[PDB]
Design a protein around this ligand. Structure first.
Ligand SMILES: O[C@@H]1[C@@H](O)[C@H](O[C@@H]2CO[C@@H](O[C@@H]3CO[C@@H](O[C@@H]4CO[C@@H](O)[C@H](O)[C@H]4O)[C@H](O)[C@H]3O)[C@H](O)[C@H]2O)OC[C@H]1O
Ligand SMILES: [Ca+2]
Ligand SMILES: [Ca+2]
Ligand code: NA
Ligand code: NA
Length: 131
């Protein structure tokens, strides 16, 4: 069951990135020009987690050459929830969905993403129940 879909471009604050038009399914925009140090805050749109436990986080990503990684966290940087490697997809607008699990406490969260290594674009993020 889906808890939230967050379009990557709908950040309340950011550093070092730029929006661009995406040709991915559904159109709209993606965040691009993501490099080490860059970040996206979704603190403006808190998401409610109904119960403590495991959640599946999905990211809609594109990467010409691979090598990227990100850290999913609360905005401001702590606690950190998890990290994920972003694979090469064949190009900047060739999209795939990647995923990992993290533990989240129940209640209102203000999420953020920190790029540890660049080379990827982000269309949206999705938070899902597991159990
Ligand atoms: O006396 C009564 C007033 O208190 C009441 O005012 C309402 C109070 O609630 C207001 O909504 C608030 C707005 O802030 C939200 O938290 C933010 C969530 O995003 C975060 O990024 C940010 O940092 C937080 O500050 C909070 O959840 C929400 O409840 C509302 O706008 C006011 O109208 O009005 C009725 C009076 O009788
Ligand atoms: Ca950048
Ligand atoms: Ca988008
Ligand atoms: Na492409
Ligand atoms: Na980089």
């Amino acid at each position: 069951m889906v808890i939230a879909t967050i379009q990557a471009e709908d950040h309340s604050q950011q550093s070092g990135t730029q929006q661009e038009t995406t040709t991915d399914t559904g159109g709209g925009k993606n965040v691009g020009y993501i490099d080490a140090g860059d970040w996206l805050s979704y603190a403006g749109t808190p998401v409610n987690i109904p119960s403590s436990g495991s959640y599946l986080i999905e990211y809609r990503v594109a990467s010409q050459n691979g090598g990227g990684s990100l850290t999913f966290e609360e905005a401001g940087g702590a606690p950190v929830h998890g990290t994920i490697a972003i694979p090469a997809t064949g190009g900047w607008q060739t999209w795939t969905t990647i995923q990992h699990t993290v533990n989240l406490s129940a209640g209102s969260h203000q999420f953020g993403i920190k790029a540890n290594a660049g080379g990827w674009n982000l269309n949206w993020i999705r938070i899902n129940k597991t159990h």
